[PDB]
Structure 1
Amino acid sequence: IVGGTSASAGDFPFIVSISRNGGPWCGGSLLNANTVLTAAHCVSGYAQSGFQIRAGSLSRTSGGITSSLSSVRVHPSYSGNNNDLAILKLSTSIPSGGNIGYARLAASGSDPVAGSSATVAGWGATSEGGSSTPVNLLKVTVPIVSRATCRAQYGTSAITNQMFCAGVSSGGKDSCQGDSGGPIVDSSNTLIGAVSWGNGCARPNYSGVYASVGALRSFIDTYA
């Protein structure tokens, strides 16, 4: 997260860190006791044994509750950056309570309204291409950018109806490498997307691009 502040305990009860090969990698959202939602590109085709999920902590490396993976299912229409969601099943079920809870999802068919305020969180870099990442979870609030403006930035075909955008025209506030798969919420803390892709991090005139929960509810609901 670029331009962020520390998350407080309980800010995102459902957030998980996803380590790979013992190191930082992605974020995700706990949907129920045995299921995590993340970005497809975090997991697709990689050895599943490399991943460890941690819930209930502001850190990736201690606290809360961990699990390995039992299975991985990417969206059936995943291609390139498009439809960048995956359902992970956990080897160890994770109960709600305390600072752990399950995500509430954006309504089917919803689409975040341009100019509304969203909050994204993760353990990724604090600068583009940064090598160091923070121990504790960061968050940042940015406005939704219309799909039309996002298509002006990236190209018409590049931004689909299963993506939405968020960021500030001047840059300086964004998700970044290592934040992929983690949550972006609306002002009510409802899960509206997963961190997906963008041109660098926090650059002027290049929004962050998110996989849209409102657009991808059929997949999520079927397999959660």
Structure 2
Amino acid sequence: IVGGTSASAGDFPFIVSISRNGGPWCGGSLLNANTVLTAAHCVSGYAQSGFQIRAGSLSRTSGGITSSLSSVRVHPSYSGNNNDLAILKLSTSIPSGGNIGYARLAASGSDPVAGSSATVAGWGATSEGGSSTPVNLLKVTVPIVSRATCRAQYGTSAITNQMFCAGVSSGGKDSCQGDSGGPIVDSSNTLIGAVSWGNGCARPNYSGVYASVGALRSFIDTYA
């Protein structure tokens, strides 16, 4: 996360850190006791045995509850950067209680409103090309960027209705490498997307691109 601040215990009760080959890799959201929502690009085609999920901790290396994966369901039309969602089934159930809770999803057909505030969290880089990965969770608040402005930045066909954008025109606040799959929530803490892609991190006039839960609810509901 670029230009963020440390998350407080219980900020994101549903966030999970996803390690791969024992190293930092992605973020995710706990939907219920055995299901995690992440970005398809975090898991598509990789050996599932390499992954571990950690819930109930601000730290990606210790505390909370861990689980291996039982199965992975990547959106069937995942291609390029589009439809970048995957559902993970956990071999260890994670009960709600304490600092663990399940996400509340945006409504089917909802589209985040340009200008509204959204908060993204993760354990990713704190600068584009940055080396170090935080051990403790970071968060950042950015406004939603209209799809029109976003298409202005990336191209009309690069930004689909299965994506939404967020960022500051001047840059400096964004999701970065290792934040992929993690949550983006609205002002009410409703899960509206998953960190997906962008051009570098926190660049002026290059918004962060998020997989849209509202537009992909049929996929999510089929497998949650």
* Structure 1 residue 129 displacement after superposition: 1.3
| CA–CA separation in structure 2 for the residues paired with 1:131 and 1:22 | 17
* Structure 1 residue 131 displacement after superposition: 1.4
Per-residue CA shift, 1:69-127, capped at 9, x if unaligned? 00001011111000000000001000000000000000110000000000000000000
| CA–CA separation in structure 1 for the residues paired with 2:135 and 2:89 | 25
| CA–CA separation in structure 1 for the residues paired with 2:17 and 2:156 | 33
The aligned counterpart of 2:200 is: 200
The aligned counterpart of 1:30 is: 30
The aligned counterpart of 2:106 is: 106
* Structure 1 residue 66 displacement after superposition: 0.2
| CA–CA separation in structure 2 for the residues paired with 1:208 and 1:197 | 6
What do you get for the CA RMSD once the two structures are aligned?
0.4
* Structure 1 residue 132 displacement after superposition: 0.5
Please, which moves more after superposition, 128-137 or 9-18?
128-137
- Unaligned residue ranges in structure 2 (runs of 5+): none
Q: Secondary structure at the match of 2:214?
A: coil
* Structure 1 residue 130 displacement after superposition: 1.0
Q: Secondary structure at the match of 1:215?
A: helix
Q: Secondary structure at the match of 2:120?
A: strand
| CA–CA separation in structure 1 for the residues paired with 2:2 and 2:70 | 33
| CA–CA separation in structure 1 for the residues paired with 2:61 and 2:49 | 17
| CA–CA separation in structure 1 for the residues paired with 2:159 and 2:83 | 11
| CA–CA separation in structure 1 for the residues paired with 2:32 and 2:131 | 32
* Structure 1 residue 134 displacement after superposition: 0.7
| CA–CA separation in structure 1 for the residues paired with 2:129 and 2:157 | 26
| CA–CA separation in structure 1 for the residues paired with 2:144 and 2:223 | 28
| CA–CA separation in structure 2 for the residues paired with 1:131 and 1:41 | 21
Q: Secondary structure at the match of 2:215?
A: coil
| CA–CA separation in structure 1 for the residues paired with 2:99 and 2:50 | 26
The aligned counterpart of 1:3 is: 3
Q: What's the % identity of the aligned pairs?
A: 100
Per-residue CA shift, 1:31-88, capped at 9, x if unaligned? 0000000000000000000000000000011001000000001011111000000000
* Structure 1 residue 164 displacement after superposition: 0.0
- Unaligned residue ranges in structure 1 (runs of 5+): none
- Deviation >4 Å, runs of 4+: none
Per-residue CA shift, 1:127-183, capped at 9, x if unaligned? 001110111000000000000000000001100000000000000000000000000
| CA–CA separation in structure 2 for the residues paired with 1:60 and 1:51 | 13
